[PDB]
Amino acid sequence: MRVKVIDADAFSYIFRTLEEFIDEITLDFTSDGLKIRGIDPSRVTFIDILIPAGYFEEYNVEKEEKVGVKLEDFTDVLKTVTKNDSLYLETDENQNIKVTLDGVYERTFTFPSIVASEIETPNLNLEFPFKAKALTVTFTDIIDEIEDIGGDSITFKAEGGKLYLSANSDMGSSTIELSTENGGLLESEGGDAESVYGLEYVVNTSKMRKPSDTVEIAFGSQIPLKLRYNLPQGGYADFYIAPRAE
Amino acid sequence: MRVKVIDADAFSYIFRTLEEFIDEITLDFTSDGLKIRGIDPSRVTFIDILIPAGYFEEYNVEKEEKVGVKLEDFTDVLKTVTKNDSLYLETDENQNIKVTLDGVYERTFTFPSIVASEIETPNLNLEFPFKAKALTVTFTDIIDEIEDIGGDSITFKAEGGKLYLSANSDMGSSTIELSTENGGLLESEGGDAESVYGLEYVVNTSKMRKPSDTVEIAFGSQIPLKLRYNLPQGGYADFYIAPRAE
Amino acid sequence: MIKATYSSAKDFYSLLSGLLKVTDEIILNFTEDSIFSRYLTDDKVLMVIFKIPKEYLEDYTIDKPLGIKININDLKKILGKAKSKSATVTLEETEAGLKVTVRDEKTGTRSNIYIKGEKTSIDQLTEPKVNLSVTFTTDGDVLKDIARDLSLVGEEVEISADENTVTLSTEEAGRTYKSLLKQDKPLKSLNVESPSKAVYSIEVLKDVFKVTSISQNVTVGFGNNIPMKIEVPTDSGGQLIFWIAPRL
Amino acid sequence: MIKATYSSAKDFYSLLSGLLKVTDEIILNFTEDSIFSRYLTDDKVLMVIFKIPKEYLEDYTIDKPLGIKININDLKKILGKAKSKSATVTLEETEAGLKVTVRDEKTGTRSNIYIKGEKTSIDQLTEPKVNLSVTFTTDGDVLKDIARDLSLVGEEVEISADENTVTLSTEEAGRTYKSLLKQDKPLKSLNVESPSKAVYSIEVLKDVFKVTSISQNVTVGFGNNIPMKIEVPTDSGGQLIFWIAPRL
Numbered sequence: 001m002r003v004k005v006i007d008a009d010a011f012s013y014i015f016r017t018l019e020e021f022i023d024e025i026t027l028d029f030t031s032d033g034l035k036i037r038g039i040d041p042s043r044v045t046f047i048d049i050l051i052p053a054g055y056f057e058e059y060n061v062e063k064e065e066k067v068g069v070k071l072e073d074f075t076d077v078l079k080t081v082t083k084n085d086s087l088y089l090e091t092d093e094n095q096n097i098k099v100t101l102d103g104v105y106e107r108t109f110t111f112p113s114i115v116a117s118e119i120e121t122p123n124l125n126l127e128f129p130f131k132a133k134a135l136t137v138t139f140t141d142i143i144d145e146i147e148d149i150g151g152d153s154i155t156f157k158a159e160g161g162k163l164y165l166s167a168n169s170d171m172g173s174s175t176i177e178l179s180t181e182n183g184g185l186l187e188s189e190g191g192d193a194e195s196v197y198g199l200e201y202v203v204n205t206s207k208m209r210k211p212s213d214t215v216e217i218a219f220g221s222q223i224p225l226k227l228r229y230n231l232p233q234g235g236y237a238d239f240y241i242a243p244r245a246e
Numbered sequence: 247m248r249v250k251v252i253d254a255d256a257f258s259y260i261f262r263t264l265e266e267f268i269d270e271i272t273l274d275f276t277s278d279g280l281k282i283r284g285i286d287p288s289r290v291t292f293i294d295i296l297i298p299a300g301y302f303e304e305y306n307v308e309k310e311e312k313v314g315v316k317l318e319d320f321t322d323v324l325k326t327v328t329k330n331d332s333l334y335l336e337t338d339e340n341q342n343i344k345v346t347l348d349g350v351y352e353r354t355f356t357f358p359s360i361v362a363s364e365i366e367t368p369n370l371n372l373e374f375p376f377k378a379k380a381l382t383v384t385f386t387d388i389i390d391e392i393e394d395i396g397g398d399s400i401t402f403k404a405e406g407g408k409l410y411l412s413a414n415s416d417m418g419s420s421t422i423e424l425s426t427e428n429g430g431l432l433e434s435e436g437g438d439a440e441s442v443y444g445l446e447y448v449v450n451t452s453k454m455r456k457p458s459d460t461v462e463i464a465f466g467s468q469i470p471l472k473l474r475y476n477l478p479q480g481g482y483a484d485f486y487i488a489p490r491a492e
Numbered sequence: 493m494i495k496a497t498y499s500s501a502k503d504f505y506s507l508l509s510g511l512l513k514v515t516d517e518i519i520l521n522f523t524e525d526s527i528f529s530r531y532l533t534d535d536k537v538l539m540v541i542f543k544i545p546k547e548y549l550e551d552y553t554i555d556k557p558l559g560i561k562i563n564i565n566d567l568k569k570i571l572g573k574a575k576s577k578s579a580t581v582t583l584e585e586t587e588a589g590l591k592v593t594v595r596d597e598k599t600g601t602r603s604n605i606y607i608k609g610e611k612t613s614i615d616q617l618t619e620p621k622v623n624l625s626v627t628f629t630t631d632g633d634v635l636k637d638i639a640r641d642l643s644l645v646g647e648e649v650e651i652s653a654d655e656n657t658v659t660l661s662t663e664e665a666g667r668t669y670k671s672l673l674k675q676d677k678p679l680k681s682l683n684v685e686s687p688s689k690a691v692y693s694i695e696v697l698k699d700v701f702k703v704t705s706i707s708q709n710v711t712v713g714f715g716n717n718i719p720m721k722i723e724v725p726t727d728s729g730g731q732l733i734f735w736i737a738p739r740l
Numbered sequence: 741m742i743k744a745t746y747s748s749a750k751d752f753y754s755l756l757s758g759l760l761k762v763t764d765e766i767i768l769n770f771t772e773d774s775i776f777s778r779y780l781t782d783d784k785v786l787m788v789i790f791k792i793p794k795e796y797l798e799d800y801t802i803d804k805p806l807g808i809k810i811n812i813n814d815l816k817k818i819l820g821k822a823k824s825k826s827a828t829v830t831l832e833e834t835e836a837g838l839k840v841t842v843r844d845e846k847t848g849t850r851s852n853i854y855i856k857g858e859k860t861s862i863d864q865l866t867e868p869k870v871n872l873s874v875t876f877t878t879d880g881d882v883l884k885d886i887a888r889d890l891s892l893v894g895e896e897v898e899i900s901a902d903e904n905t906v907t908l909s910t911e912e913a914g915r916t917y918k919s920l921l922k923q924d925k926p927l928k929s930l931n932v933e934s935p936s937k938a939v940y941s942i943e944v945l946k947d948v949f950k951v952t953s954i955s956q957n958v959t960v961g962f963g964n965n966i967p968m969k970i971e972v973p974t975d976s977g978g979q980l981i982f983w984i985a986p987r988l
Contacts, residue, residue: 353672
């Protein structure tokens, strides 16, 4: 297949985020778009990404084609993209992935193909008691601030339509209120809910800042936290984080 | 005697400067004004200060009265003056000096009298080949900057009416030009001259910034450097620094 | 259980930071009339009192008197997390100890901490009972300035007052110090029931005076050879109270 | 004695900071046609040349050729003291060694340093004599970018060019890299006398390329299995010249 990305700068951060969770990813190019799916070693976080054909300026995939690649090497070349760089992904028939950065000068990196595991969907059906939408920038900022605060877990608590993130340290905690009132949230749905999640897993999604415009936060007692970082052209990056990751 | 100073904040810095050179000073109150004269242990620097009666708001000295005092203790109480503090100097008949700070609240410190040496004038007659005038603030700034640079000596060189201060380090140096051109000097007199002086001795006069409006710089080969920090009401603070203090 | 709310995290922190020579552990006493903590230095010369009248405690629930011995250091850490100067504080009793929460509506943030603390019987507040012949009020900054002065000269401060003037004097190694405090300079108020005089340790008077700077209206009381009382009020009610044993 | 003036302290410093693997001591050669210093790395693969044509030396007095072995570190310290980017530099021979002065009229300041240095006979400049089949010019930033790329993949760079395209290629552990440089992208100029190809060490080519960023007009020349020449000009005349031995 052959695909072309214009804003390759933001595009690269999608994969820099994934580095925090997994070592190898499986780029699954389908007729509908680029599907990426992985799960961290602790199995605490399940990642479901969909980058529709419309997201790209050019999308040419005749039949489905899966190509796995060591994320570190792939991200090492993605970090070298500029603001005015266009990106090209392709397969050299040898199944090897081709990354072509086109800007001041043209350059092509190639990575060997590796065995790619199939990731089974962890949750058959999930009903979220509470659901909130917010600016990815506003949300990630708070997430980075929570990382600075530190802690083993982050309590997500919904009350009266407002979201309360409590960075749970040891014997103490620091809470931040998000709401339509203080501009923290754009909107709210459902009723009250509360559960705890691993701090590192939530924080490590902060590098979705650039690529994602808005982020949807959904959670509930004893059920996974679903962070959906919305992407242009109806795309998304879902992060399911397991409950009680104290 | 009984004397009163209004701007005691600046007045105090005259004595904070002296701390750099001498331990004990002899306040010599005369009909003409307060004469202060000292000489550092190395005998490299001779200090001749005259604070005329007009400098003070009130000056009541019937007959000449010399009173020596440990400068550290006297300066320790001078440091405690504010912007709106008025100062009073007096003798409690026991020859002991009285310092009365008057502001938010009134307070009086007293120091025991000590044996005061008589300081003989080192130079019968001195003819300076070159002489320059400059803003004390402009000059002291440069002096502080020379202290930051560091070195064992400062070469004072006059050429074409311009003054060149070279902070002589080891095997190297950094020079700063002062002239009417760059606003460094206000005026120039005499011809060309050049000699070297101890860096620390010159630098230690920088705390004359506040009290002194303008400073007169005079020097020549094999003759002392005369820094005259002009004071209000025709007063002055002369610093004679010996040549070749490498 | 016991639950109380104070309107100023900042002021609360200033008070605790004023506890001179305070060990790592203090006993917070919750009573009907006030929350308070009081300890007496080993030398028994200075009594430090921290007191918050019930008038300045909102939503104050208390079944029966009780004291919780807690680590003052931990309580300072949480109060420093005050995002704003308008942040409030709540004290909530716990089986394990004491839960402290700082709330700042301005920034839409909060912070808490569960402090392990032994529960004991209230340590009764035993302030010296005497007649303060002389009382005066002044901004703490002035007293701090006087503390700096004293840290220069003497070893014992002699404070004395007539109808219109309070005088402090020290003497050491031929050096002398003597300041005069009068109405409107700098005293905001002066009450002299009768000419009085006392002597106090400079070491102690200095430390205390320096602390009183956190208040703009420090009240100092004393009398003939009797303990001196310093009151350090805050704009939110919280109060620091010192008692200095005179040198006899 | 020898005395020369260069119009840019900053550029002089950039050149010296580009001397790869340069030991603490270098030999400044003062000749009629230029001041220059040249050393060859121990592996003998890379020749570093620093050269300032006499055209860019003002007030240049010289009785007879001579070389002064000086500590490059000291010469860097003085050049860093450049208050402005318009500061000039003078080189003056001394019995003890070399006197370097940096003058900045803008700030009305100066600085000097007397460097102890052994006096010797000029180390003749022996550049490889070959025909550069291919030469191209580009901003150093691009080459630096290519250096970053190369520091990712291969171990040997294969550079080759046809009439309109210069190609660099590397391969390691299944990974591949291949960049293409053409006219106006990013090459400012391209001269291909004939299709050529050579291989060079990535370690060396990377280090050199990274350094060439101090220039906006780097000239790269090479040919079939012959050494590659990099010219790093400055806006004041000072010039860096590299020679890389190809892998045969």
